[PDB]
Design a protein around this ligand. Structure first.
Ligand code: HQD
Length: 167
């Protein structure tokens, strides 16, 4: 049993809810919240900007030190950093950004990072300002992630379309 409430069950391991991930993280304090990161961990907008704002910029400060030491992530890659006030850990995952012309086949690689964690609160990778089709992102998630994932969907309209169209 876990703390997650109000989710629709899509599969054995994937759950979905129309919820503000910042507000969901603040309520649940999950072991892992996933950030929709870029390779520079520049948390300017979307999931990244909202999560970072909720940490009072502490996520960005920590991220800048990580990049100064390690250099950029790979598209499809990830790193584990602090969850600050939102979670124990933040898994920063880089999905491909279609608005930069990145290979959508890298979305499966991105979701494979989730399998290193037994339970996660996450957004749909490569959705929103990353430009991918969220219906596609949900299909890749279901077909790739084997651990227990609780997906928070920012738009109510999109949430209802993801549920209604789910095979
Ligand atoms: C408070 C808040 N929460 C979000 C959660 C997921 C994606 C984008 C956002 C956003 O833009 C915003 O302002």
């Amino acid at each position: 049993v876990n703390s997650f409430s109000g989710y629709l069950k899509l599969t054995d391991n994937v759950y979905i809810k129309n919820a503000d991930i910042v507000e969901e993280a603040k309520k649940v304090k999950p072991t892992v919240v996933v950030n929709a990161a870029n390779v520079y961990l520049k948390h300017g907008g979307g999931v990244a900007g909202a999560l970072n704002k909720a940490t009072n910029n502490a996520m960005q400060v920590e991220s800048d030190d990580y990049i100064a030491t390690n250099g950029p992530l790979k598209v499809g890659g990830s790193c584990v950093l602090s969850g600050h006030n939102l979670a124990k850990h933040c898994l920063h995952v880089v999905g491909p950004n279609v608005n930069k012309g990145e290979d959508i086949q890298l979305l499966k690689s991105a979701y494979e990072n989730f399998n290193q964690h037994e339970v996660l609160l996450a957004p749909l990778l490569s959705a929103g300002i990353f430009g991918a089709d969220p219906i596609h992102s949900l299909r890749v998630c279901v077909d790739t992630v084997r651990t227990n994932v609780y997906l928070a969907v920012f738009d109510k309209n999109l949430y209802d379309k993801l549920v209604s169209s789910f095979l």
